UniProtKB/Swiss-Prot annotation, chain A:
It comes from the Viruses. Belongs to the lambda phage major capsid protein family. Assembles to form an icosahedric capsid shell with a T=7 symmetry although with a diameter of about 82 nm, which is a larger volume than the usual T=7 capsids. A dramatic reconfiguration of the capsid shell that expands the procaspid from a diameter of 66 nm to a supersized capsid of 82 nm, allows packaging of the large viral DNA genome. The capsid decoration protein binds the expanded capsid and stabilizes it. It comes from Thermus virus P23-45. This is Major capsid protein.
Swiss-Prot record, chain C:
This is Decoration protein. Cooperatively binds the expanded capsid, thereby stabilizing the mature capsid shell and allowing the large viral DNA to be packaged. Trimers of capsid decoration proteins molecules are located at local and icosahedral threefold axes and stabilize the expanded capsid, which shows increased spacing between capsomers. It is found in: Virion. Homotrimer. Interacts with the major capsid protein. It comes from the Viruses. The chain holds residues 50 to 98 of 146 of the full protein.
């Protein structure tokens, strides 16, 4: 435990957790001369923490 | 325990993307007044994207207002107008943009509000031909303009 | 030339297309489109209807 110094009494650590949407998925297979089809919807999440 | 309090959670914000559609099929939408009868807060709960079909009150005290369709009312099946895609702030304004003609995939339709999210509904796909939809791929092709 | 195709609703070959036989009731009922450009079935079994 290397020592450290501060001027204030209480110590608050606020952690911000982040689950970004993972770049997954393969490009859809189609035949030349066709209208394309769209991609799915993905989710990202943010949670926090107090200590 | 007492002098050191460990980690907890204050807020949990899960953010979804939007309901996909075809680029080269063309979207046609008209804004509609909201029937105050149904609980729109119960259709707009989750952050996950859903898209429920909407019928319209034809004639009466509320002629022009729209409301989410029930699969047991034959008049609601004979008065369907389209689906609401991107969700809506139900109290910041009543008036919602109902898409008449678009193409939405098989899993993003949820006409029961207490249904599993982003999974294909069963009674919708079993009652599509009376409801003037058509599936070719997963994508629900429809044109309630025509 | 061109010719009209028809999807299969259900079966072991459910989803595939075959040319619309005018004498048959399901090809008349389940017609799905037509083929214009020409293709090579020895090259690929996936036509663009």
């Amino acid at each position: 435990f290397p020592e450290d110094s501060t001027f204030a009494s209480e110590l608050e650590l606020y952690l911000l957790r982040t689950q970004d949407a993972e770049q997954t998925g393969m490009t859809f297979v189609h035949q030349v001369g066709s209208t394309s089809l769209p991609v799915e919807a993905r989710v990202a999440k943010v949670d926090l923490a107090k200590a | 325990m007492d002098k050191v309090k460990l980690f907890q959670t204050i807020g949990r914000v899960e953010y979804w993307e939007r309901v996909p559609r075809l680029h080269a099929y063309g979207v046609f939408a008209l804004p509609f007044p909201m029937d105050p009868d149904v609980n729109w807060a119960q259709w707009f709960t989750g952050p996950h994207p859903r898209a429920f079909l909407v019928s319209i009150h034809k004639y009466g005290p509320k002629a022009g207002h729209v409301y989410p369709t029930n699969l047991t009312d034959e008049d609601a099946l004979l008065n369907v107008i389209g689906m609401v895609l991107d969700g809506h702030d139900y109290e910041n304004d009543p008036n919602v943009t109902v898409t008449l003609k678009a193409a939405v995939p098989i899993e993003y339709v949820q006409q029961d509000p207490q249904a599993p999210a982003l999974q294909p509904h069963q009674a919708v796909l079993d009652a599509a031909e009376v409801l003037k939809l058509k599936v070719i791929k997963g994508h629900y092709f429809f044109d309630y303009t025509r």
